[PDB]
Amino acid sequence: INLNQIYTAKEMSERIGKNRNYLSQAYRNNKHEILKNFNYRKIGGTIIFSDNPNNDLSQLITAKEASQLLGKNDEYFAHIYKRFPHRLEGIDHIYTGKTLFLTKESLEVFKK
Ligand SMILES: [Br-]
Ligand SMILES: [Br-]
Ligand SMILES: [Pt+2]
Structure with missing residues (x-):
C-alpha cells in the first residue's frame, strides 16, 4: 500500500473534478455504477479512496x-x-x- 495515494471520499471527489459530496452521495445512495470504477473501502467511519487500483x-x-x-x-x-x-x-x-x-x-x- 502506498499511503501517499490515500484520500477521504470528499478529497477524492475533488481529485476527480466533482463537488466535495459526489462520492459520498454515490455511496449513500448506492450508485454502484459509479462506485465500481473506484478503489475504495469503508475503514472505521471513513470511506477511503485511492486513485491507484x-x-x-x-x-x-x-x-x-x-x-x-x-x-x-x-x-x-x-x-x-x-x-x-x-x-x-x-x-x-x-x-x-x-x-x-x-x-x-x-x-x-x-x-x-
Ligand atoms: Br490523547
Ligand atoms: Br490528544
Ligand atoms: Pt492525547
Missing part, C-alpha cells in the same frame, strides 16, 4: 483499532502521534479525514 486498502486499519489490538486505550496511537511523532518513524501511517490510520504490516513493525 493496485493499492490494497484492506491493509489499512484505524489507529483506534490498532490501539485496541495492542490492549491499549482507544487513543493510544493518536496520543503518541501527537506528542511523540518520532515513535512512528519507520511505521507506515497516514492522518486524513481527521483520523490516524496504520497498516496491518506497520502495526507488526511497531511491536518489534
Whole structure:
C-alpha cells in the first residue's frame, strides 16, 4: 500500500473534478455504477479512496483499532502521534479525514 495515494471520499471527489459530496452521495445512495470504477473501502467511519487500483486498502486499519489490538486505550496511537511523532518513524501511517490510520504490516513493525 502506498499511503501517499490515500484520500477521504470528499478529497477524492475533488481529485476527480466533482463537488466535495459526489462520492459520498454515490455511496449513500448506492450508485454502484459509479462506485465500481473506484478503489475504495469503508475503514472505521471513513470511506477511503485511492486513485491507484493496485493499492490494497484492506491493509489499512484505524489507529483506534490498532490501539485496541495492542490492549491499549482507544487513543493510544493518536496520543503518541501527537506528542511523540518520532515513535512512528519507520511505521507506515497516514492522518486524513481527521483520523490516524496504520497498516496491518506497520502495526507488526511497531511491536518489534
Ligand atoms: Br490523547
Ligand atoms: Br490528544
Ligand atoms: Pt492525547
